[PDB]
């Protein structure tokens, strides 16, 4: 029976003439699945799982809404249904694979967090389809999901998608991105060494003035900020051909010029680092 | 003309032009390949060194290329220190490209200088430099030193840890520096520190690029340091399961593939459960193919036996059901992997509640077959390969399915294209070769299929006739009918290439159908456009004629035995004359001539034996003088002992001197030698001292591998002759006539089972030779080396091995036994210095030191013999047999002292 | 990836002697 | 030697590993696809970054057909606002293409980096190599394009040495001509050095 069904399915795939035999095969598969659900108990899908896979493969329909399916998927996410979520995700992916439409910019963040919370097997393709023909600011949703949602592995993909679609490190939304890089995460060093070697020099100077600026809120982590300073001093593009490790100790080669209040802010920041002392000690 | 090439190319090296120097430098690797001896290697490498020292930075890249290519000759350099100093004298220059080239040269030279400290200091100093080409060359040389040195490994562990998580040195450089951590397996705590750093890196830089590089590095560390490979297999299962990215999953696939190929015994049960479970709920198909490819490679080893180990019903196990729905999947490759898994479960461990899967297994194969027959694409061709290999293995493991197996195959031999007839004929050939009882069950059906090929296409036609007539010869285990010969003959008269008929003729000579071999060899004899090929085909024709004469025998008829033996000897002698005429200096056919000569000697031993059995009926009981051996027949059968034992020794000598044949040719030589031992034991148990036999064959006479039908019929004949010998042991008189009848029936039984010209008679796959350039002074021709007759002669034999192709295909050289001997050529004869030494080659080189004591007065004859020892342990007697001449002079003061004394 | 291990006739397993034999033997292309 | 030494094996065949595990289906990208990706009337740097980042992994022989679109579209890569990976990765792709098709690449890059038009050939570039230093004003503060220009200038200086030697050797039908060629080469290299050092000055607009 499995060999006969596999032979019939290859003919249905090859024989794309009007899909009438495809409809007959789908009806036969639905009837066989109903009979197997009604009668088959001990033989738990030894060959009926092949029929289930064929029915899932033949159910690749095209959604005609492509806007209300996000709400249906969000409702299915609260209901905690696996096959319903898989069918909804497969329907949403084919609809996005069609001609582009106007997607909502509010429910997309909730839908992405729902497929990232539960283990979704089709998360990457759905995210690629949603971010390819995106009718809105995808970087804001990606940054919000990265900063707020504490997804363990999948956030790494989100990190990739950040650098995959935001050309610089800072392009359009500076505030959320600055609080993403500097806070009071685990992906922080990669994006920070990016921003060391990614951004244009005027943008780097804008960040260096806003970072060591006068601010009593202490919105930036001192370790990341100070290491960003020390990296910007010794970028290999600055010293790309200078003779190395034969200097004069009396001579000073180059420095970075900052202002008086910049010096005061930097020294109070480094002493605020030095006053933490959770377990480090005096030495 | 060995150093003359060196002076020519170094005359090219002393030009003032960059082009001629570059031409000589890049011509050096051919000269390296032509003479591989370390005198030339050392000289040319020192010349390359002091050309590298002064150069315009483009010669340096060429010498770097030559050093990269000729890596296996690097251990032959003698003056290592001068070479490395001349190379190292460029690090202190100020051109960064020249420095980078010199660090790359150090990285290439890493094998010969593992523990040079200034090299490590230069790598560390240039490693944190600012010129990018210097940095990249430093990472290359750090990778190449870190694979061999340990102190370098720990210091560079600290340094590369700092520069990877130093947050400068951008992401491309980090990707370049993680393989430094890959090469870092030398010590336990070093490996643990590298493991912690890699775990921190993979959780700290969660990208697509760095995760792939770090995971490949981490698994090379795991496969190098076999202390916690299960931990990495575990971590790979969480990375393959809980990660949304796709390329990371693909590395997890190729990673588990490498780990299952390397160390499959460490795969635990829950690891296979996790891999199968992750293979179920995947939505993609390429990922499905990858995981089940990993499980298919895991199914061919002892991991299944660990998986199906006692202390759940194995029907409910995840692997078998996963194998079922991927065997019944739409895609061809996943079906091939699944049917491999199911076949491997069937061939493996024999628990009762798996046997039902056997049925599923066989149906799966034919289902897959009818999917992949009518497609004609290289992917479908590979699916045919995989399916037919599974068919062979499935029929091999469980013979009681096998008959069903073969009949299903014949069904798809009715309706498939010209590329599917082949390899199905090959599968039938293998199955009908080792297990013969099914072969006849085809017989005539192949006839009508062969008839269809009368009107088939032309492009793949010749190979297809070759395959069909080969499986015809294999299936005809007893004989071929005259009508079968007629239909085969008329079909290849209808259309043939001329080389196709040669392949059919040699297949028939292999299997034992020598009459069709006769006819096709006639056809070849009228053909063909060269001298020695004509003589070769004439020799093969004569051999086929003698073997048909040997097939024309009748049991219990000694007259026909003498007649047909005489016909076989005369046809073999026309054939051996043709073989001797066919021998060429370029192709010195040595196996064929010796095999045919010993076959002739075996049949003449049989002829003298049969007429000696006739002598008891052709002479008196003894004489009137004799009234415990009486008569000339006792002396004649003692001569039969001498001849048969010498013949067995000569068969052994032919076995030991080949080393380049396959298993089948060697086993056939063993069959002939065992026939000689059989007849020798049979005679020395019946007539010549029955008293001290007392054995009655106290060894096993059954449960044989039976790799060929000829082997099986040989073993049956051997067992029958030994049964006749045990029964007729000590009942009758020492001369007797049941004894002579026993020898007669033994000779008839040996000559009834025809012959098998094996693969090494026709084609040679592996060619291995040894050089052994003797250098005491190498002499010239008749000029002998002068020795002073108060000191020994330091012979200094040195050798190199030459491989024809695919280095070692069947057997691999483990050690080589050089033997030396002397001989007083003036006329024991100087046996006092027979010497033996064992050599283990490094790459190809043999270097030993031999001292030969020439003491008496005269001209002595040094002979040098080689003897290859293989991996299993069998010694093989090949070698050039090199001879050299020495003259022994005397000191005039010593001569006057001996005259005065 | 080969089905028959003792196959005498693979894609390229032909030694030199058989190579010149094939070269001088496929050219004629007729058999009586 | 720089072009051949950037071809060498770096550490562990990481590039081979990437071309094994990331370019399974890159046949969708085409030179003309990059052509309208560049020539969009807004500046959508995301899709061109997509295409070029996928173009990193290809071999140089497979990267030959994209030389036309890359070289023709270098000139757009000078406006204030281009992201830095576009410049750096076009520099990397130019370095990859420099290993296979160097002369045609250089003569095509001269005709694109010129200010905004004269179409220049290889003979004019070998006669005079200072047109390489006659590029756009914005090239002087774009580090990847200046790196390309510097490799190009060094190559054309060596080219002019070989060309003057060959033209002197052919047109004999001798010491004075040889020393005149030596003086021309010396003054030529000195002029190239002086123009480079004057590029190294800070401009008066930023001072």
For B:318-357, CB contacts with A below 8 A are 321, 324-325, 328-330
Q: Alpha helices of A42-187 — where are they, by DSSP H?
A: 48-58, 69-79, 82-97, 107-111, 113-117, 123-131, 138-148, 154-165, 174-181
Q: Which two tokens stand for residue B766?
A: 């592996």
Is the separation of the CB atoms in C27 and B409 below 8 Å? Answer: no
Q: What is the DSSP letter of B459?
A: T
Give how far the C-alpha of residue B117 lies from the chain's centroid of Cα atoms, to the nearest Å: 42
Say how far apart CA A99 and CA A106 lie, in whole Å.
Answer: 21
Sign of CA dihedral A160, A164, A165, A170: positive
Contact B97 D18 (CB under 8 A): no
Please name which of A217, A228, A145 lies closest in space to residue A184, comparing C-alpha atoms.
A217
Is the separation of the CB atoms in B124 and B156 below 8 Å? Answer: yes
- Residues B536, B541, B547, CA angle at the centre, nearest 5°? 130
Q: After which residues is chain B broken (C to N over 2.5 A)?
A: 311, 627, 827
Task: Report resolution in angstroms.
Answer: 4.1
| Nearest-CA distance B576 → chain A (Å) | 58
Q: B touches A (3+ CB pairs < 8 Å)?
A: yes
Contact B130 A53 (CB under 8 A): no
Of B101, B247, B254, the CB nearest to D5: B101
Contact A190 B282 (CB under 8 A): no
CA torsion B578-B584-B590-B594 (nearest 10°) is 20
Q: Which two tokens stand for residue B391?
A: 């068919």
Q: Alpha helices of B453-513 — where are they, by DSSP H?
A: 461-475, 482-494, 500-511
Q: What is the DSSP letter of B824?
A: B
The H or E element that residue D32 is part of is: helix D31-38
- Strand B882-888 and strand B860-865: pairing? antiparallel
What lies within 8 Å, CB to CB, of B410 at 6+ separation is B428, B442, B445
Is the separation of the CB atoms in B739 and B725 below 8 Å? Answer: no
- Residues B122, B128, B131, CA angle at the centre, nearest 5°? 95
Which chain B residues are Cβ-neighbours of A10 within 8 angstroms?
330, 371
- The b/e string for B47-70 (b: 16+ C-beta within 10 A; e otherwise) is bbbebbeebebebbbbbbbbbeeb
Of C3, C5, C8, the CB nearest to B423: C3
Q: Which two tokens stand for residue B396?
A: 């091999």
Which chain B residues are Cβ-neighbours of D11 within 8 angstroms?
136, 139-140, 143, 176-177, 179-180
What lies within 8 Å, CB to CB, of A123 at 6+ separation is A115, A116, A154, A157, B244
B134: helix, strand or coil: helix
Give how far the C-alpha of residue B100 lies from the chain's centroid of Cα atoms, to the nearest Å: 42
- Closest residue in B to D24 (Cα) is B247
| Nearest-CA distance D88 → chain A (Å) | 10
How many residues are there in chain C? 32
Contact D5 B97 (CB under 8 A): yes
**Residue B352: φ, ψ to 5°:** -65, -50
Please name which of B528, B567, B160, B246 lies closest in space to residue B520, comparing C-alpha atoms.
B528
Is the separation of the CB atoms in B736 and B687 below 8 Å? Answer: yes
D37: helix, strand or coil: helix
Q: Which two tokens stand for residue A12?
A: 């249905």
What lies within 8 Å, CB to CB, of B365 at 6+ separation is B339, B343, B387, B390, B391, B394, B405, B408
Q: D touches C (3+ CB pairs < 8 Å)?
A: no
Q: How many CB atoms lie within 10 A of CB B618?
A: 10
CA torsion B664-B668-B671-B676 (nearest 10°) is -150
Give how far the C-alpha of residue B704 lies from the chain's centroid of Cα atoms, to the nearest Å: 24
**Chains B, C: CB pairs < 8 Å:** 87
**Residue B888: φ, ψ to 5°:** -105, 105
Contact B165 A189 (CB under 8 A): yes
- Closest residue in B to A86 (Cα) is B283
How many residues are there in chain B? 901
Is the separation of the CB atoms in A200 and D84 below 8 Å? Answer: yes
Say how far apart CA A237 and CA B169 lie, in whole Å.
Answer: 10
Q: How far is CA B811 from CA B659, B758, B842, in A?
A: 8, 18, 17
Contact B140 D11 (CB under 8 A): yes
- Residues B595, B597, B599, CA angle at the centre, nearest 5°? 70
How many residues are there in chain A? 283
Q: Which two tokens stand for residue A75?
A: 């409702």
- Residues B153, B155, B158, CA angle at the centre, nearest 5°? 105
Please name which of B448, B447, B428 lies closest in space to residue B438, comparing C-alpha atoms.
B428
Percent of chain B as helix, strand, coil, to the nearest 5: 60, 5, 30
Q: A touches D (3+ CB pairs < 8 Å)?
A: yes
Residue with tokens 């061809």: B332
Q: E-strand spans in B343-446?
A: none
Contact A167 D143 (CB under 8 A): no
Contact A167 D45 (CB under 8 A): yes
Of B388, B463, B510, the CB nearest to C3: B388
How many residues are there in chain D? 207
Of D9, D14, D21, the CB nearest to B250: D21
- Strand B882-888 and strand B785-787: pairing? parallel
């Amino acid at each position: 029976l499995q060999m006969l069904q596999w032979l019939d399915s290859p003919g249905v795939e090859g024989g794309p003439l009007r899909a009438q035999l495809r409809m007959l095969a789908s009806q036969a598969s639905a009837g066989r699945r109903l009979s197997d659900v009604r009668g088959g108990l001990l033989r738990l899908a030894e060959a009926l799982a092949f029929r289930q896979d064929l029915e899932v493969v033949s159910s690749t329909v095209r959604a005609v809404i492509a806007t209300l399916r996000s709400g249906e998927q969000c409702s299915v996410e609260p209901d905690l249904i696996s096959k319903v979520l898989q069918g909804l995700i497969e329907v949403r992916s084919p609809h996005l694979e069609e001609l582009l439409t106007a997607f909502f910019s509010a429910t997309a963040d909730a839908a992405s967090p729902f497929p990232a919370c539960k283990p979704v097997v089709v998360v990457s393709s759905l995210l690629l389809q949603e971010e390819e023909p995106l009718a809105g600011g995808k970087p804001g949703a990606d940054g919000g999901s990265l900063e707020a949602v504490r997804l363990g592995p999948s956030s790494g993909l989100l990190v990739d998608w950040l650098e995959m679609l935001d050309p610089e490190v800072v392009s359009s939304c500076p505030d959320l991105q600055l609080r993403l890089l500097f806070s009071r995460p685990s992906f922080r060093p990669y994006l920070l060494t990016l921003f060391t070697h990614q951004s244009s020099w005027p943008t780097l100077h804008q960040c260096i003035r806003v970072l060591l600026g006068k601010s009593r809120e202490q919105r930036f982590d001192p370790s990341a900020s100070l290491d960003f300073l020390w990296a910007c001093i010794h970028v290999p593009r600055i010293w790309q051909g200078r003779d190395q490790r034969t200097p004069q100790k009396r001579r000073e080669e180059l420095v970075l010029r900052v202002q008086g209040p910049e010096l005061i802010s930097l020294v109070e920041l480094i002493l605020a680092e030095a006053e933490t002392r959770s377990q480090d000690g005096d030495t | 003309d060995a150093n003359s090439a060196l002076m020519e190319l170094d005359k090219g090296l002393r030009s003032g032009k960059l082009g001629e120097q570059c031409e000589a430098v890049v011509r050096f690797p051919r000269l390296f390949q032509k003479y591989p001896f370390p005198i030339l290697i050392n000289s040319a490498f020192l010349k390359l060194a002091d050309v590298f020292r002064v150069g315009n930075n483009f010669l340096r890249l060429c010498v770097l290329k030559v050093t990269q290519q000729s890596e296996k000759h690097l251990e032959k350099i003698l003056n290592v220190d001068e070479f490395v100093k001349r190379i190292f004298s460029v690090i202190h220059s100020n051109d960064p490209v020249a420095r980078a080239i010199t660090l790359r040269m150090l990285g290439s030279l890493a094998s010969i200088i593992p523990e040079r400290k200034n090299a490590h200091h230069s790598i560390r100093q240039s490693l944190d430099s600012h010129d990018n080409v210097e940095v990249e060359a430093a990472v290359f040389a750090a990778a190449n030193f870190s694979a061999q040195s340990k102190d370098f490994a720990v210091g560079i562990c600290n340094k590369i840890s700092e520069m990877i998580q130093g947050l400068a040195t951008p992401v491309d450089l980090k990707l370049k520096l993680i393989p430094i951590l890959q090469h870092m397996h030398h010590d336990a705590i070093l490996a643990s520190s590298a493991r912690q750093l890699l775990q921190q890196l993979v959780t700290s830089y969660p990208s697509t690029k760095m995760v792939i590089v770090s995971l490949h590095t981490f698994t090379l560390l795991a496969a190098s340091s076999l202390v916690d490979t299960p931990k990495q297999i575990q971590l790979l299962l969480q990375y393959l399961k809980n990660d949304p990215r796709k390329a990371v999953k693909r590395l997890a696939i190729q990673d588990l593939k490498l780990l299952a190929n390397k160390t499959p015994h460490t795969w635990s049960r829950e690891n296979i459960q996790a891999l199968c479970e992750c293979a179920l709920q995947t939505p993609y198909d390429s990922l499905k193919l990858g995981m089940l490819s990993v499980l298919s490679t895991l199914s061919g080893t002892i991991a299944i036996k660990h998986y199906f180990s006692i202390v759940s019903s194995p029907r409910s196990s995840d692997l078998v059901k996963l194998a079922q729905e991927c065997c019944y999947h739409n895609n061809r490759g996943i079906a091939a992997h699944g049917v491999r898994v199911l076949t491997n479960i069937t061939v493996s461990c024999q628990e009762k509640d798996l046997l039902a899967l056997e049925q599923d297994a066989v149906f799966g194969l034919e289902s897959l077959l009818v999917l992949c027959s009518q497609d004609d694409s290289p992917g479908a061709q590979a699916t045919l390969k995989i399916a037919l290999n599974c068919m062979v293995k499935l029929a091999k493991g469980r013979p009681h399915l096998s008959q069903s197996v073969v009949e299903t195959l014949l069904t798809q031999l009715h309706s498939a294209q010209d590329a599917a007839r082949i390899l199905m004929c090959h599968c039938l050939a293998a199955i009908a070769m080792q297990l013969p009882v099914l072969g006849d069950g085809m017989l005539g059906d192949l006839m009508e299929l062969y008839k269809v090929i009368g009107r088939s296409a032309t492009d793949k036609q010749q190979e297809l006739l070759v395959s069909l007539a080969t499986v015809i010869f294999v299936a005809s285990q007893k004989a071929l009918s005259v009508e079968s010969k007629a239909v085969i003959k008329q079909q290849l008269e209808s259309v043939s290439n001329g080389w196709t008929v040669y392949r059919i003729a040699r297949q028939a000579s292999r299997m034992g159908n020598h009459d069709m071999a006769k006819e096709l060899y006639q056809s070849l004899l009228t053909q063909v456009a060269s001298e020695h090929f004509y003589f070769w085909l004439n020799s093969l024709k004569e051999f086929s004629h003698a073997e048909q004469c040997l097939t024309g025998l009748q049991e219990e008829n000694y007259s026909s035995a003498l007649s047909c033996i005489a016909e076989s000897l005369k046809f073999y002698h026309k054939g051996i004359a043709s073989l001797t005429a066919a021998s060429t200096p370029l192709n010195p056919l040595s196996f064929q001539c010796e095999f045919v000569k010993l076959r002739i000697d075996l049949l003449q031993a049989f002829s003298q034996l049969i007429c000696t059995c006739n002598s008891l009926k052709t002479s008196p009981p003894p004489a009137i003088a004799t009234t415990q051996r009486c008569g000339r027949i006792s002396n004649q059968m003692k001569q039969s002992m001498e001849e048969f034992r010498s013949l067995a020794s000569r068969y052994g000598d032919l076995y030991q001197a080949s080393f380049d044949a396959d298993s089948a040719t060697l086993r056939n030589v063993e069959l002939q030698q065992q026939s000689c031992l059989l007849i020798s034991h049979a005679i020395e148990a019946l007539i010549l001292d029955p008293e001290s036999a007392s054995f009655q064959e106290y060894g096993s006479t059954g449960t044989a591998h039976a790799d060929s039908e000829y082997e099986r019929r040989m073993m049956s004949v051997y067992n029958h002759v030994l049964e006749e010998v045990e029964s007729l042991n000590r009942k009758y008189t020492p001369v007797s006539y049941m004894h002579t009848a026993c020898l007669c029936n033994a000779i008839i039984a040996l000559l009834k089972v025809p012959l098998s010209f094996q693969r090494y008679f026709f084609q040679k796959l592996q060619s291995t030779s040894i050089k052994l350039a003797l250098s005491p002074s190498p002499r010239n021709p008749a000029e002998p080396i002068a020795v002073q007759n108060n000191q020994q002669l330091a012979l200094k034999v040195e050798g190199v091995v030459q491989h024809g192709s695919k280095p070692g295909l069947f057997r691999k050289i483990q050690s080589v036994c050089l033997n030396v001997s002397s001989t007083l050529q003036s006329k024991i004869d100087n046996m006092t210095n027979e010497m033996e030494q064992r050599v283990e080659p490094h790459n190809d080189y043999f270097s030993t030191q031999f001292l030969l004591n020439f003491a008496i007065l005269g001209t002595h004859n040094i002979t040098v013999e080689s003897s290859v020892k293989d991996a299993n342990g069998i010694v093989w007697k090949t070698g050039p047999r090199t001879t050299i001449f020495v003259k022994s002079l005397e000191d005039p003061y010593s001569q006057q002292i001996r005259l005065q004394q | 990836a080969h089905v028959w291990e003792d196959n005498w006739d693979d894609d390229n397993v032909e030694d030199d002697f058989s190579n010149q034999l094939r070269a001088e033997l496929e050219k004629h292309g007729y058999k009586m | 030697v720089d072009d051949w030494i950037c071809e060498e094996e770096i550490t562990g065949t990481d590039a081979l590993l990437r071309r094994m595990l990331l370019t399974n289906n890159a046949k969708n990208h085409s030179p003309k696809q990059l052509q309208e990706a560049f020539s969009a009337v807004p500046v959508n740097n995301t899709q061109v970054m997509q295409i070029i980042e996928h173009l990193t992994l290809l071999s140089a022989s497979e990267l030959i057909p994209y030389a036309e679109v890359l070289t023709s579209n270098m000139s757009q890569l000078l406006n204030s606002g281009v992201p830095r990976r576009i410049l750096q990765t076009v520099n990397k792709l130019w370095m990859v293409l420099n290993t296979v098709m160097p002369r045609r690449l250089w003569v095509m890059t001269v005709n694109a980096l010129q200010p905004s038009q004269q179409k220049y050939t290889q003979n004019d570039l070998m006669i005079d190599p200072l047109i390489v230093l006659r590029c756009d004003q914005r090239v002087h503060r774009c580090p990847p394009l200046m790196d390309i220009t510097l490799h190009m200038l060094n190559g054309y200086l060596l080219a002019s040495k070989a060309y003057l030697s060959a033209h002197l050797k052919e047109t004999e039908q001798e010491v004075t001509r040889e020393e005149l060629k030596n003086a021309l080469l010396a003054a030529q290299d000195s002029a190239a050095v002086q123009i480079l050092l004057e590029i190294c000055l800070p401009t008066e607009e930023e001072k």
